[PDB]
Enzyme design. Structure first.
Site, PDB file in Angstrom:
ATOM      1  N   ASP A  43      -0.073   8.250  61.681  1.00  0.00           N
ATOM      2  CA  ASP A  43       0.528   9.481  62.167  1.00  0.00           C
ATOM      3  C   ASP A  43       1.760   9.174  62.989  1.00  0.00           C
ATOM      4  O   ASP A  43       1.741   9.181  64.240  1.00  0.00           O
ATOM      5  CB  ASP A  43      -0.536  10.326  62.914  1.00  0.00           C
ATOM      6  CG  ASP A  43       0.001  11.713  63.244  1.00  0.00           C
ATOM      7  OD1 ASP A  43       1.072  12.117  62.771  1.00  0.00           O
ATOM      8  OD2 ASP A  43      -0.692  12.393  64.063  1.00  0.00           O
TER       9      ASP A  43
ATOM     10  N   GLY B  38       0.778  20.871  71.267  1.00  0.00           N
ATOM     11  CA  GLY B  38       2.090  20.837  71.771  1.00  0.00           C
ATOM     12  C   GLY B  38       2.477  19.536  72.506  1.00  0.00           C
ATOM     13  O   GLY B  38       3.663  19.368  72.758  1.00  0.00           O
TER      14      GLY B  38
END
Ligand SMILES: N=C(N)c1ccc(CO)cc1
Ligand SMILES: [Ca+2]
Ligand SMILES: [Mg+2]
Length: 223
Positions: free
Chosen positions: A84, A175
């Protein structure tokens, strides 16, 4: 960041905000022209906001620079979240000063128990939702690969570390993705995943940056 505190203004000078009309993820400045973030953050258009503390007010130290190239790891898997990681090339170099600075890549992987600093403008609530103006920080240790693997049976690859707490209450969140985990002056983690945020026995899982220095340096040199 759940269970954190407000960072000192500009004290995390490698932290960026990725913006597509609003903040959506963090990143880390690792070269004057390159930011590293999480591939699950991908958007085709990104403005990189450097030098921020209050993402909702222009306080003067900011540099807003558009992404020229966005490169996701070729072996990113959206199911397992293995690899990732994403690189963003700035359209012009960031200007390095006390408020905008690179962070070192890892010289080695980090020992279990190493203290780190996690930061971001993600959700600060463990129930419901609140998105801060001011950058949030959290001190948290690298967990053993064992403590990590017992928390997420069969889901921790060799490219992931857990950083955080088993008791709950202190974690990164939505976020914060893409943002930094810095341990002894080195970028060791990228906010990647976990089950909810700040839940008991569900510590944050982070891309293991010390396995990617060749990929980062090779990608920078080609572009
Ligand atoms: N619990 C976490 N550390 C966590 C961080 C980020 C994300 C991104 O959706 C999920 C979970
Ligand atoms: Ca600002
Ligand atoms: Mg807001």
């Amino acid at each position: 960041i759940v269970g954190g505190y407000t960072c000192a203004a500009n004290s995390i000078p490698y932290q960026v905000s990725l913006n597509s009309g609003s903040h959506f993820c963090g990143g880390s400045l690792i070269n004057s022209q390159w930011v590293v973030s999480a591939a699950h953050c991908y958007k085709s258009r990104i403005q990189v906001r450097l030098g921020e503390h209050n993402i909702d007010v222009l306080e003067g130290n900011e540099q807003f620079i558009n992404a020229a190239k966005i490169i996701t790891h070729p072996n990113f898997n959206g199911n397992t979240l293995d690899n990732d990681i994403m690189l963003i090339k700035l359209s012009s170099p960031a200007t390095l000063n006390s408020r905008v600075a690179t962070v070192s890549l890892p010289r080695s992987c980090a020992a279990a128990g190493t203290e780190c600093l996690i930061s971001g403008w993600g959700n600060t609530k463990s129930s419901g939702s609140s998105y801060p103006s001011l950058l949030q920080c959290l001190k948290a240790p690298v967990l053993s690969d064992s403590s990590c693997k017992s928390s997420y049976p069969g889901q921790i690859t060799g490219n992931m570390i857990c950083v955080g707490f088993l008791e709950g209450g202190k974690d990164s969140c939505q976020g914060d993705s893409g943002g930094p985990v810095v341990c002894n002056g080195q970028l060791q983690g990228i906010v990647s995943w976990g089950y909810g945020c700040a839940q008991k026995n569900k510590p944050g899982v982070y891309t293991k940056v010390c396995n990617y220095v060749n990929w980062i340096q090779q990608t920078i040199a080609a572009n």
